[PDB]
Write a protein that holds these residues in place. Sequence first.
Motif, PDB file in Angstrom:
ATOM      1  N   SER A  82       0.756  -1.251   0.000  1.00  0.00           N
ATOM      2  CA  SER A  82       0.000   0.000   0.000  1.00  0.00           C
ATOM      3  C   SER A  82       0.785   1.299   0.000  1.00  0.00           C
ATOM      4  CB  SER A  82      -0.934   0.167   1.200  1.00  0.00           C
ATOM      5  OG  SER A  82      -2.233  -0.334   0.988  1.00  0.00           O
ATOM      6  N   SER A  83       0.487   2.223  -0.892  1.00  0.00           N
ATOM      7  CA  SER A  83       1.025   3.580  -0.796  1.00  0.00           C
ATOM      8  C   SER A  83      -0.061   4.542  -0.321  1.00  0.00           C
ATOM      9  CB  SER A  83       1.570   4.055  -2.123  1.00  0.00           C
ATOM     10  OG  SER A  83       2.791   3.349  -2.277  1.00  0.00           O
ATOM     11  N   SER A  84       0.271   5.516   0.514  1.00  0.00           N
ATOM     12  CA  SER A  84      -0.706   6.455   1.063  1.00  0.00           C
ATOM     13  C   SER A  84      -0.363   7.928   0.827  1.00  0.00           C
ATOM     14  CB  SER A  84      -0.882   6.220   2.560  1.00  0.00           C
ATOM     15  OG  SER A  84      -2.128   6.677   3.082  1.00  0.00           O
ATOM     16  N   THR A  85      -0.946   8.555  -0.179  1.00  0.00           N
ATOM     17  CA  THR A  85      -0.739   9.990  -0.443  1.00  0.00           C
ATOM     18  C   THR A  85      -1.801  10.951   0.133  1.00  0.00           C
ATOM     19  OG1 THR A  85      -1.470   9.367  -2.683  1.00  0.00           O
ATOM     20  CG2 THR A  85       0.803  10.055  -2.468  1.00  0.00           C
TER      21      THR A  85
ATOM     22  N   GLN B 264      -2.727   2.059  -4.226  1.00  0.00           N
ATOM     23  CA  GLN B 264      -2.416   3.428  -3.883  1.00  0.00           C
ATOM     24  C   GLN B 264      -3.636   4.101  -3.264  1.00  0.00           C
ATOM     25  OE1 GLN B 264      -0.666   6.235  -3.359  1.00  0.00           O
ATOM     26  NE2 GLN B 264      -0.744   7.665  -5.003  1.00  0.00           N
TER      27      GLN B 264
ATOM     28  N   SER C  95      -5.240   7.507  -1.643  1.00  0.00           N
ATOM     29  CA  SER C  95      -5.138   8.964  -1.581  1.00  0.00           C
ATOM     30  C   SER C  95      -6.384   9.588  -0.999  1.00  0.00           C
ATOM     31  CB  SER C  95      -4.966   9.595  -2.934  1.00  0.00           C
ATOM     32  OG  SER C  95      -3.955   8.982  -3.734  1.00  0.00           O
TER      33      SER C  95
ATOM     34  N   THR D  31      -9.111   4.481  -3.345  1.00  0.00           N
ATOM     35  CA  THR D  31      -8.103   3.510  -3.717  1.00  0.00           C
ATOM     36  C   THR D  31      -7.916   3.357  -5.211  1.00  0.00           C
ATOM     37  OG1 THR D  31      -8.646   2.347  -1.728  1.00  0.00           O
ATOM     38  CG2 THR D  31      -7.370   1.090  -3.332  1.00  0.00           C
ATOM     39  N   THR D  32      -6.681   3.163  -5.616  1.00  0.00           N
ATOM     40  CA  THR D  32      -6.331   2.983  -7.024  1.00  0.00           C
ATOM     41  C   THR D  32      -5.339   1.845  -7.236  1.00  0.00           C
ATOM     42  OG1 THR D  32      -6.299   5.376  -7.148  1.00  0.00           O
ATOM     43  CG2 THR D  32      -5.767   4.131  -9.145  1.00  0.00           C
TER      44      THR D  32
ATOM     45  N   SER E  38      -4.070  10.852 -12.427  1.00  0.00           N
ATOM     46  CA  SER E  38      -4.238  11.069 -10.988  1.00  0.00           C
ATOM     47  C   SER E  38      -4.928  12.335 -10.523  1.00  0.00           C
ATOM     48  CB  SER E  38      -2.922  11.050 -10.258  1.00  0.00           C
ATOM     49  OG  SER E  38      -2.191  12.242 -10.496  1.00  0.00           O
TER      50      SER E  38
END
Lengths: 268, 268, 5, 5, 60, 60, 283
Positions: free
Chosen positions: D2-5, F3, F5, F19-20, F33
């Motif tokens: 998981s990435s969290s921006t 991902q 955000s 979520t992506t 994005s």
Amino acid sequence: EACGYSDRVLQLTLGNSTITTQEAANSVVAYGRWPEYLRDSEANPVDQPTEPDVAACRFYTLDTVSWTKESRGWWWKLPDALRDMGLFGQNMYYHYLGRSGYTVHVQCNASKFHQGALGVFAVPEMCLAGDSNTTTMHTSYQNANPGEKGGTFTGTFTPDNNQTSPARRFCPVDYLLGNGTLLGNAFVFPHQIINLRTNNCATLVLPYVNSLSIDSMVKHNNWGIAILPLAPLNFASESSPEIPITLTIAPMCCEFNGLRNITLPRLQ
Amino acid sequence: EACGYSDRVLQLTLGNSTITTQEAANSVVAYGRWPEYLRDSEANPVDQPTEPDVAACRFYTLDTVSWTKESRGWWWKLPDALRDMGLFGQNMYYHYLGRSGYTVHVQCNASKFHQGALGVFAVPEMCLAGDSNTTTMHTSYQNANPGEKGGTFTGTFTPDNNQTSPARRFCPVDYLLGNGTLLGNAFVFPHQIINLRTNNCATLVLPYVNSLSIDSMVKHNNWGIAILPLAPLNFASESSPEIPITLTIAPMCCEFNGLRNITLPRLQ
Amino acid sequence: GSSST
Amino acid sequence: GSSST
Amino acid sequence: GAQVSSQKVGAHESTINYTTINYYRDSASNAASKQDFSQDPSKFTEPIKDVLIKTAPMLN
Amino acid sequence: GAQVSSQKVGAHESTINYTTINYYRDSASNAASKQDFSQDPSKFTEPIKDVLIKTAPMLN
Amino acid sequence: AATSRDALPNTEASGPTHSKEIPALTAVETGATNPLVPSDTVQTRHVVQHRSRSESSIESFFARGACVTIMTVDNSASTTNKDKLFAVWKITYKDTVQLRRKLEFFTYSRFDMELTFVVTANFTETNNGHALNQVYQIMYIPPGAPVPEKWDDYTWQTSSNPSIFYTYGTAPARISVPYVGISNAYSHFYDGFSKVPLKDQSAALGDSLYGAASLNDFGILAVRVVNDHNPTKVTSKIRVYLKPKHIRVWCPRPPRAVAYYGPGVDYKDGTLTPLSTKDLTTY
Ligand SMILES: CCCCCCCCCCCCC/C=C\[C@H](O)[C@H](N)CO
Ligand SMILES: *C(=O)CCCCCCCCCCCCC
Ligand SMILES: *C(=O)CCCCCCCCCCCCC
């Protein structure tokens, strides 16, 4: 300043209004006092004052007059000249009492080939002389108070002789400053000179001045603005040159006491 | 309170004005919100607002109307009813934008032998129905905005049939609250009742309510005041009793943006 | 990853 | 993961 | 980014849950959570300046 | 490879997220994005060699 | 922290009373409603209350799609006195009545809009000639963008306007829209005008409709059959369904009691008697 700042180039901003100038001769603050609100230690009417702030403390431009070779001079009274100016005038006529300071900006540009010099004087209590030699102190309210058109000076005293129906107006002789004192001494009052080769405007910041903290603006004028040609207008070899003079004036720190119904004065 | 304080006895003071009452039924604050100035986090026009404070936030008394056995009801709009009230009206017409809250105090006294009950309703966006059945949304600005005289309700819908020159006014039917909804439900709007055996006044404190932080006061009315006889006037055995109704209203926390020349509306 | 209300 | 921006 | 919440279980056959993942950048695209709050009616039912004590005389 | 955000939530009913997951090898296949940057207009609005101080005379 | 699905308060048991406490006596003149509960005027038992107000939360009350319009289009050969029919609709919730009445329980609102489109087609003339499956273009034209004058003109390129190309017989189309109001809330009622009539101006020049604010509040939907025409005629209808998601509302109002008569609050003669006869002392 090495970042360009000059004594000759100014911007003034009050309320939603800005004045720019590129040919000033600095600006004057009368008697070194900047305008202020009435302090509690000097207060007198006890009711909450009205302070219209930007609604009234903004630049109002009066009707432009015209300077010619035959011009002897012009005068205005404050607050009278502003009595019909937006919410300042409204606030003035709705209240018994009012006090106010002013930024006075006189405007007159020409060209490097014109010449002439206007003395612009702000006089506290500028009482002017009447037209009669049968009566004294008889200038009517209507004639004393021209509103924004102001009045003018004359080079000649000419007495009103109609005794049936007297004119009841001022007869302000220029070299006597309209009040029986010599014009050459008017420079003890706060002033600037618009000498066309040097500058195209005069800026006078006037404090509220009076023998009271607050007074009837409708009965009493605190300041007089007198503009007189110290050196006459001249241009190239034209017999009949003309350049305009415009007054823009802003009330500053004005407050009003004694609210009631609006005053409807007899002005004509 | 054991020092005499009562729910029925109040004093209200705004500016140079005081209202007293000895027969109140408490007072109402609409939607529990007291009036406030516009906060920076909700602000929108960026110019310095004008806030006339005591000059405009004071009690103005409108023309007194008369309640009789045949009265169907009265209505007013805010700010419209106050458009000619001292410096509030002046400040309103000099600016593009304005917002204001209000203390509304309806006055109606009688005697222990009279009876009757007025429902006093403050309605946000009190849109009223027109007189036409050939056209919709056609009530003119002039007829929509009566100023301080207000308008009235009727018990009968009566359509304007002059198609050549339409009346272009409202036809507000009382049991339909003048807007096509049943009067018995008007109590969901902030209200009080003047029931003559109980109280002789109604006091409604209204916040500025709108879908915007500030708006055109001249184009748009935020609040409507509707007064209707819920139980009819009656006295002893007089066939024709009459008692007066007086409205006194004060603007609260009003501020104005977008100063220019004064608006001169077509009102007739 | 996961929120749990 | 998981990435969290 | 999965959001796990509990169902209020009505007819029965521990807490039963359900999962939600937002597929779009714009919150406007999201379904309604139905996780809403309640408030007291007072601003409409008791809009008076002086607090009402129901056992007391409303007028005093 | 998910991902997560945050959405900028406009009308409301903590941070709401979305979520992506990229399903393809080629970045060209990806959605946009919309996580974009801003810049100062200067290269177009003040392209002058000597920095402008707005309170100062532009010409000196 | 109290939620919409929380249970309501328990009834507390209460006994006989004889005191100066007077819950039952009150005074509606104040403008307040007396906050009573059964134990204030009768003897009660203890009850553990399970019921909740979950289905009457503002969201749950509005959480339904409602039909707001029906748009008609056709796929016919354009011929000198009549062109192929495309439809144009000014977006509004006031062309139908049910969603309008629900929204009008309140003065102002904020919400995200969910639009669902149900599309149906039929043959209008007897010939046994057929048609192939139709694709529809639903173009949103916001105030200011060029409205189509012909089913096939340049505006249907949609480089910037959002369009939906819907295929016949597939699932009903659906898009979402954020709160797009130019005010901080949508006004269900606007007691005012969009123009001030000035005295120095003619009456015509200062005139405007009572209660209307922006003329084209939200713009237009323009719908067309993208297909070229068949020998046979097919007519279609696009039914538009509006659901307000993520909704907030302010200032409650009495509901519409007499039939709607236009976009304003006006009423028609002959419709003003909603209530029926019933005798005062008849149950
Ligand atoms: C491809 C389809 C795109 C559809 C886009 C629709 C955008 C416009 C949304 C309109 C919002 C309408 C809101 C309802 C009405 C207003 O509440 C009231 N009449 C007052 O403002
Ligand atoms: C948070 O979401 C981390 C866990 C990811 C779980 C699987 C997601 C399921 C597929 C979502 C696809 C993305 C939708 C745009
Ligand atoms: C990172 O992605 C690790 C977590 C995987 C989460 C579930 C993925 C959902 C299905 C994606 C299928 C692959 C698409 C080519």
